[PDB]
Design a protein around this nucleic acid. Sequence first.
DNA 1: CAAAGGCCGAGGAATGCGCCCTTTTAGCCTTCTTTTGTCAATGGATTTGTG
Length: 51
Amino acid sequence: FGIDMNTDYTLEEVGKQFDVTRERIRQIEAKALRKLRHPSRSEVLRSFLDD
DNA sequence: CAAAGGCCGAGGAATGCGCCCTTTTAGCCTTCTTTTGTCAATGGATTTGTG
């Protein structure tokens, strides 16, 4: 994502700095998103949702 | 000898105002190549199982 930097880096350019061919980098993004998906870790972020 | 009237011009609303044809320009619309995000394999290095 683009937090605290002017991008928006993409998977190949990300995995360059981690030496992954973008597949493990996809997996790592997915794992972090799943971890933050948990309640008791994202109740505030839930409140930020508007609906 | 003047007066009526015919003439022209100087000033305004407005019921007033192009069309047909050639030629470029914009943009949308499809078709294809490439960067990118994804699913599944397939080992391989810690984590645990064991006594």
